């Protein structure tokens, strides 16, 4: 019996610590975690970690945890996070856990300015956040200032509008009162439905240059690829539905997307590093994989997760 290797896995609301044996694959580690939290819609997630060089990487299940440059410290830090997003929140997230985990992960991104958000929408989203955290507004329980310790708005709006904390509390609160009677799980889904319609939602961006040296954005996401101008990361200039894509490939830095119709030209671009061109392809394979999967008949496992969820409501 060799020396145990401790690992610290953490979800958006839980912290797990357990030892693994030297030859544990990422797959096995992933499962223990998933079984501990009672998650089943595992296809969206993955274990995130930093390697020696400090590059944030996704743990590979088919390889030993030990032999992936997992930065060395004790315990070994991993972040359980969603790698892929659903095409439709209300139709792919069944278990209430897969829901609060997405709810949390997306709100962190909205909050962190990672997913652009207009001020109206932010306020609105905040209202659904508080209703989920505090329940029904009650003039007795939530007196002036109940929303002072909370982080509710995306900095980019606080900067863009210098209202006071109280001023903001007033706008959010007004909306908090509108959700009188709503259920916790319903407030988070209510949040997600609104979020999922944002332009930068579930999009992975990468700085690229085309044949000339014009700076650009590549947006790998659930439905295909997209090319964005540098100034506008919202609306794409050239889209690429999985449907009209023959194959995608790359060499050192030159990346190429071949159309399924030979009439359309091949889109070419260049990535900074190899490590970043590898990640792009990886995302494609995963998103395209799920894209297909959700067009196939519901598997005889996903099949009744949905029925027990019609009982719990």
């Amino acid at each position: 019996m060799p020396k145990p290797i401790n690992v610290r896995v953490t979800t958006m609301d839980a912290e797990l610590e357990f030892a693994i044996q030297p030859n544990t694959t990422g797959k096995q580690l992933f499962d223990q975690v998933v079984k501990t939290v009672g998650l089943r819609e595992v296809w969206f997630f993955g274990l995130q970690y930093v390697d020696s060089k400090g590059y944030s990487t996704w743990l590979k299940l088919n390889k030993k945890v030990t032999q992936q440059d997992v930065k060395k410290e004790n315990p070994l830090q991993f972040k359980f996070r969603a790698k892929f997003f659903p095409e439709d929140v209300s139709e792919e997230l069944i278990q209430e856990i897969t829901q609060r985990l997405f709810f949390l992960q997306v709100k962190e991104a909205i909050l962190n300015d990672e997913i652009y958000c207009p001020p109206e929408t932010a306020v609105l989203l905040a209202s659904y956040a508080v209703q989920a955290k505090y329940g029904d507004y009650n003039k007795e329980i939530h007196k002036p200032g109940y929303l002072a310790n909370d982080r509710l708005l995306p900095q980019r709006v606080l900067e863009q509008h210098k209202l006071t904390k109280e001023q903001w509390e007033e706008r959010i609160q007004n909306w908090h009162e509108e959700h009188r009677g709503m259920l916790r799980e319903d407030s988070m889904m209510e949040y997600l439905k609104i979020a999922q319609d944002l332009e930068m939602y579930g999009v992975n961006y990468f700085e690229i240059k085309n044949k000339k040296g014009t700076e650009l954005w590549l947006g790998v996401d659930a439905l295909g690829l997209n090319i964005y101008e540098h100034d506008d990361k919202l609306t794409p200039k050239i889209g690429f539905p999985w449907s009209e894509i023959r194959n995608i490939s790359f060499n050192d830095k030159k990346f190429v997307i071949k159309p399924i119709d030979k009439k359309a030209p091949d889109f070419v671009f260049y990535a900074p590093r190899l490590r970043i061109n590898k990640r792009i392809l990886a995302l494609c394979m995963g998103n395209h994989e799920l894209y297909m999967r959700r067009r196939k008949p519901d598997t005889i496992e996903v099949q009744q997760m949905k029925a027990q969820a019609r009982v719990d409501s």
């Binding site: 912290e15 797990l16 610590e17 357990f18 223990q32 501990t36």
Partner: peptide
Amino acid sequence: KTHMYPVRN
């Protein structure tokens, strides 16, 4: 070995 320490319900 196995799961020894988790914190969240």
